């Protein structure tokens, strides 16, 4: 609806940028088409379709309305063939906002090269979970989004950390509004597995090898979380939710201009959740606050500052899985799904807070530049106590391990980039040149020297977490890790012919880790980027890419001779076809991909079987591995009210000897979610469901009381979801979510420290949302 506008007659470029701004809309236009053109003047309360048409009066330009984006074009009488991937300047650097798009498919995205492109133009597997997806299925946190993400397998470490795989690999790359965090290990990484969705517009996942913007990082995927932004019109909501096992969620989200002119603007959100669980004596309080302010210094420079906060506060935390696989004499334990090996008082609370500033400037060039400053904190307070070992013993006793770790990581980021169009051989291309620096400092205390503790409980079968807390004694250890990343990067997208676009670039990287371990240094590392996209129809394009990444190894991954291994490196090879239907409203993709890892840390059994250097008691050995596989996906509008997101992925990852690895990631998986909105007398009703299936998965785990290895399998299984919403009122709606409808009982962890974990049993959630 109607928006306050005031854009005077200027260069068509500026006008278009000032429009997207004033209108909360992404505006895409071709540099060589708006050169030397004038916007006509607009002033007052206007409907955005009426406002853009006025603005373009005189320009000979056409508008394509596409949801939260408009593309502008300048039809010629000549027009002699069609450039679908023509170089196009964008007004929102991060992409198309997904909020209010009614869609499960995204618009534009800069996840791959910091160039704003569409899924179809991106020569890499890119899946997005959109704001409407999160809304409809109740995905209230990053674990929820991941479970619903095509390609992704979420498995458990314990009640407060999950693991995400793509393509053979745990994901350990996270970004916020396009800024990587340090996630070397779980000290730096507190809370990453727990981000509440209340403050995000979408989560965008780039799959393969993502060196080019992540820098040093894991193989497999990057998870990029995009924050909600302030708006030009006043709008907010309150949401209230109630579910299986005294799960109560509430949520406030307010957005608007804070001055008559609306040249300062703001958005605020808060959300609180207190929940018990199907797991006995586990409970979790979670708190999030987010505030962001936008100042327009003038028509082409905007200062933004903002801050976020999240506290994740549990009781009944476990260290590793929900119960021990084998008992004292080495039979397998049968236990209720409610069983929780955590102690009542045990807690792995994880907290995160960010303060950030950015500055963005439109050069007349058609170029835009942007500096991003960040102060981030990932903190933790972890007195963990939990039943551990081959228990029960024949008399039903068992033994608790208890250890305390507290600590904090402070991170500072500088990121600066320049992006813009340019002409080479009578045709238009774009460039990004950026440089980055991060310093992060992990500090901590460990307590493992317990003073006068009795770690035995006399009743395994009826365990309850009702065991005393120990005297933790004095600290055992103080941590001091310093990581310093420096990056410089460049990607050109050449529009070679009307059907061929060529990506050429890379990143140079300097990585230093300092402190209590010996110094880890990589200098002048080059991370190539080669990509092409070739158009075949108005509908389909093929693409190929070659992408890369490395991660200097952790300090403990040393060899025979006590030298650290060379960095864990991989290259992703990918060939593919993507399809685009209904003016971008529906996307499809089919891809073939191959990952070549070199220097993967491997144990080194012959040495470890009787070490010879007391300096490395547990040596590694750097080896090779290959992931081969393919993936299919679709997302968007099937028919007017009808939305899907579905994927199919196949993988086998082997190491050079031939043996299967990440065998707990299934070799085959499939996701489909969908909702439908009736038209007619039922137009206030939205219906929906979904299903996730995966094949066989296994672990090899060591039965230590019987001195043999065992194979633990999880037979293929489906999970089904259902969902419905009714818009009772222009302002008020009611929803219900049923998850795991057939109550399928399954495992999300087998073998992590010789333990296992169930997945959620059937669970409901009721909600009301109220929009002011
Ligand atoms: C260096 C640290 C800086 C921290 C910055 C934190 C920013 C927190 O501020 C929150 C601002 O939110 C603005 C919320 O928008 C509300 C707009 O509605 C106002 C009422 O409506 C007026 C008439 O329409
Ligand atoms: C072991 C768990 C088995 C439970 C299975 C139950 C499945 C039944 O689900 C159907 C629920 O329908 C109940 C209808 O309730 C209406 C929801 O309205 C929302 C409240 O409105 C808020 C008003 O402001």
Q: Following DSSP, what letter does each residue of 500-531 receive, concatenated?
A: EEEEEEEEEEEEEEEESSPPEEEEEEEEEEEE
CA 272, 277, 279, 281 torsion-angle sign? positive
What is the rounded CA–CA span in Å between residue 600 and residue 622? 5
Q: Which ligand is nearest to the CA of 307?
A: 1
Token look-up 């043999």 returns 708
Whether 678 lines ligand 2, by a CB cut-off of 6 Å, is no
Q: Which ligand is nearest to the CA of 764?
A: 2
CB of 530 closer than 8 Å to CB of 572? no
CA 556, 565, 522, 113 torsion-angle sign? negative
Which region, left, alpha or beta, applies to residue 307 given φ > 0 means left and ψ of -120 to 50 means alpha? beta
- 178 Cα to the center of ligand 1, angstroms: 23
Give the residue range(s) of CATH 2.40.170.20 domains in the chain. Answer: 230-772
Whether 385 lines ligand 1, by a CB cut-off of 6 Å, is no
Angle, to 10 degrees, between the axis of helix 12-23 and the axis of helix 48-56? Answer: 170
At 50, give phi and psi (nearest 5°): -70, -40
Token look-up 């994880």 returns 350
Residues facing residue 547 across a β-bridge: 529, 572
Q: What is the 3-state secondary structure of 470-490? A: CECCCCCEEEEEEEEEEEEEE
Instruction: Give the residue, by CA position, lying nearest to ligand 2 atom 13.
Output: 736
What is the rounded CA–CA span in Å between residue 16 and residue 30? 11
Closest-lying ligand 2 atom to the alpha carbon of residue 766: 19
Q: Which of 138, 244, 734 to mutate to test the pocket of ligand 2 (most atoms within 8 A of CB)?
A: 734
What is the rounded CA–CA span in Å between residue 630 and residue 687? 31
Reduced to 3 states (helix: H, G, I; strand: E, B; else coil), residue 386 is strand
Which residue from 495, 366, 429 is spatially nearest to 82, judged by alpha carbons? 495
Tell me whether the omega of the peptide bond preceding residue 94 falls within 30 degrees of 0, making it cis: no
Which residue from 116, 108, 115, 112 is spatially nearest to 125, judged by alpha carbons? 112
Q: Name the token pair of 210.
A: 């993502």
CB of 247 closer than 8 Å to CB of 283? no
- 133 Cα to the center of ligand 2, angstroms: 20
What is the rounded CA–CA span in Å between residue 189 and residue 411? 11
Whether 397 lines ligand 2, by a CB cut-off of 6 Å, is no
CB of 134 closer than 8 Å to CB of 159? no
Instruction: Give the residue, by CA position, lying nearest to ligand 2 atom 14.
Output: 736
Closest-lying ligand 1 atom to the alpha carbon of residue 255: 15
Residues facing residue 530 across a β-bridge: 504, 546
- 278 Cα to the center of ligand 2, angstroms: 18
Q: Which ligand is nearest to the CA of 734?
A: 2
What is the rounded CA–CA span in Å between residue 415 and residue 373? 7
Instruction: Give the residue, by CA position, lying nearest to ligand 2 atom 20.
Output: 734
Where does residue 538 rank: exposed (0-12), middle (13-18), buried (19+ CB within 10 A)? Answer: exposed
Neighbours of 185 (CB within 10 A): 13
Whether 734 lines ligand 2, by a CB cut-off of 6 Å, is yes
- 291 Cα to the center of ligand 1, angstroms: 7
Residues facing residue 660 across a β-bridge: 654
CA 745, 751, 756, 757 torsion-angle sign? negative
Q: Name the token pair of 472.
A: 């933790």
CB of 30 closer than 8 Å to CB of 86? yes
Give the residue range(s) of CATH 2.170.130.10 domains in the chain. Answer: 86-229
- 49 Cα to the center of ligand 1, angstroms: 28
- 767 Cα to the center of ligand 2, angstroms: 10
- 248 Cα to the center of ligand 2, angstroms: 15
- 290 Cα to the center of ligand 1, angstroms: 10
- 770 Cα to the center of ligand 1, angstroms: 20
- 257 Cα to the center of ligand 1, angstroms: 9
CATH 2.60.220.10 fits 86-229, yes or no: no
Whether 736 lines ligand 2, by a CB cut-off of 6 Å, is yes
Which residue from 223, 200, 213, 203 is spatially nearest to 417, judged by alpha carbons? 213
Q: Which CATH architecture has domain 230-772?
A: Beta Barrel (2.40)
Q: Which of 256, 304, 354 to mutate to test the pocket of ligand 1 (most atoms within 8 A of CB)?
A: 256
Q: How many helices (H) and strands (E) does the chain have?
A: 7, 41
Reduced to 3 states (helix: H, G, I; strand: E, B; else coil), residue 244 is coil
- 267 Cα to the center of ligand 1, angstroms: 6
- 229 Cα to the center of ligand 1, angstroms: 11
Which residue from 220, 158, 282, 331 is spatially nearest to 752, judged by alpha carbons? 158
Where does residue 655 rank: exposed (0-12), middle (13-18), buried (19+ CB within 10 A)? Answer: middle
Token look-up 């853009």 returns 52
Q: Name the token pair of 654.
A: 């082997």
Angle at 366 between CA 363 and CA 368, to 5 degrees: 55
Whether 242 lines ligand 2, by a CB cut-off of 6 Å, is no
Instruction: Give the residue, by CA position, lying nearest to ligand 1 atom 17.
Output: 256
Whether 234 lines ligand 1, by a CB cut-off of 6 Å, is yes
What is the rounded CA–CA span in Å between residue 432 and residue 490? 5
Reduced to 3 states (helix: H, G, I; strand: E, B; else coil), residue 52 is helix
What is the rounded CA–CA span in Å between residue 626 and residue 337? 36
Determined by X-ray
Taking the domain 1-85, which CATH number applies?
Answer: 3.55.50.30
Contacts for 468 with CB less than 8 Å, ≥ 6 apart: 453, 454
Residues facing residue 267 across a β-bridge: 255, 292
At 53, give phi and psi (nearest 5°): -65, -50
Whether 619 lines ligand 1, by a CB cut-off of 6 Å, is no
């Amino acid at each position: 609806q109607e928006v306050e506008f005031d854009i005077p007659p200027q260069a068509l470029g500026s006008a278009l940028q000032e429009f997207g701004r004033q209108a909360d809309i992404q505006v895409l236009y071709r540099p060589e088409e708006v050169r030397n053109k004038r916007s006509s003047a607009i002033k007052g309360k206007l409907e955005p379709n009426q406002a853009i048409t006025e603005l373009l009066r005189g320009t000979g330009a056409s508008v394509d309305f596409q949801g939260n984006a408009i593309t502008i074009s300048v039809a010629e009488a000549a027009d002699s063939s069609v450039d679908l991937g023509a170089t196009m300047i964008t007004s929102n650097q991060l992409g198309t906002i997904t909020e209010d798009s009614g869609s499960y498919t995204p618009g534009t995205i800069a996840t791959a090269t910091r160039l704003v492109l569409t899924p179809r133009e991106t020569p890499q597997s890119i899946t997005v979970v959109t704001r409407q997806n999160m809304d409809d299925f109740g995905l209230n946190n990053i674990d929820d989004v991941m479970r619903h993400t095509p390609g992704i397998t979420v498995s458990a470490y314990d009640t407060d950390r999950n693991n995400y795989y793509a393509r053979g690999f745990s994901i350990n790359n996270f970004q916020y509004d396009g800024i990587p965090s340090t996630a070397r290990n779980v000290g730096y990484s507190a809370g990453n597995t727990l981000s509440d969705m209340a403050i995000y517009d979408r989560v965008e996942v780039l799959k393969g090898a993502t060196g080019l913007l992540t820098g040093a990082g894991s193989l497999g995927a990057t998870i990029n979380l995009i924050r909600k932004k302030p708006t030009h019109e006043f709008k907010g909501h309150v949401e209230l939710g109630a579910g299986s096992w005294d799960n109560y969620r509430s949520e406030l989200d307010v957005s608007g201009p804070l001055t008559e002119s609306g040249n300062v603007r703001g958005r605020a959100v808060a959300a609180y959740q207190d929940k018990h669980s199907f797991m006995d004596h586990y409970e979790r309080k979670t708190s999030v606050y987010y505030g962001i302010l936008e100042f327009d210094l003038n028509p082409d420079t905007m200062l933004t500052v903002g801050a976020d906060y999240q506290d994740n506060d549990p009781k009944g935390s476990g260290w590793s899985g929900s119960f021990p696989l084998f008992d004292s004499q080495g039979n397998r334990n049968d236990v209720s799904r409610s069983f929780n090996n955590g102690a009542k008082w045990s807690s792995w609370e994880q907290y995160t807070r960010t303060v950030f500033a950015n500055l963005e400037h439109n050069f007349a060039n058609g170029w835009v530049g942007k500096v991003q400053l960040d102060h981030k904190i990932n903190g933790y307070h972890a007195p963990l106590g939990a039943i551990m070992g081959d228990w029960p013993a024949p008399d039903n006793s068992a033994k608790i391990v208890a250890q305390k770790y507290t600590g904090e990581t402070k991170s500072n980021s500088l990121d600066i980039y320049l992006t813009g169009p340019f002409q080479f051989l009578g045709r238009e291309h774009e460039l990004v040149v950026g440089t980055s620096a991060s310093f992060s400092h992990w500090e901590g205390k460990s307590y493992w020297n317990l003073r006068n503790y009795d770690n035995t409980t006399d009743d395994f079968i009826n365990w309850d977490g009702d065991i005393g807390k120990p005297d933790w004694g004095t600290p055992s250890q103080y941590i001091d890790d310093k990581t310093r990343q420096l990056g410089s990067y460049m990607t050109a997208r050449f529009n070679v012919t009307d059907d061929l676009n060529l990506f050429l670039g890379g990143r140079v990287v300097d990585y230093r880790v300092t402190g209590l371990n010996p110094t880890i240094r990589e200098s002048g590392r080059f991370i190539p980027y080669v990509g092409a996209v070739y158009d075949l129809n108005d509908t389909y394009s093929v693409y190929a890419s070659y992408t890369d990444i490395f991660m200097p190894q952790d300090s403990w991954y040393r060899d025979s001779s006590n030298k650290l291994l060379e960095p864990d490196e991989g290259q992703n090879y990918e060939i593919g076809i993507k399809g685009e239907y209904l003016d971008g409203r529906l996307n499809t993709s089919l891809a073939y991909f191959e990952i070549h890892e070199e220097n993967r840390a491997e144990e080194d059994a012959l040495y470890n079987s009787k070490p010879t250097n007391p300096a490395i008691t547990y040596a590694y050995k750097g080896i090779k591995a290959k992931t081969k596989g393919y993936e299919a996906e679709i997302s968007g509008e099937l028919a007017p009210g009808w939305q899907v997101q579905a994927g199919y992925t196949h993988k086998i990852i082997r190491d050079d000897s031939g043996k299967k690895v990440s065998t707990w990631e299934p070799q085959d998986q499939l996701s489909l979610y969908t909702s439908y909105k009736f038209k007619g007398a039922l137009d206030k009703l939205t219906v929906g469901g979904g299903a996730r299936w995966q094949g066989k998965s296994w672990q090899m785990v060591y039965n230590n009381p019987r001195s043999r290895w065992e194979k633990f399998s999880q037979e293929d299984y489906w999970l089904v979801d259902l969902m419905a919403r009714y818009q009772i009122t222009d302002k008020l709606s009611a929803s219900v979510n049923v998850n795991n409808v057939f109550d399928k009982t399954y495992y999300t962890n087998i073998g992590f420290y010789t333990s296992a974990s169930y997945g959620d049993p059937r669970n409901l959630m009721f909600s009301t949302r109220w929009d002011f």
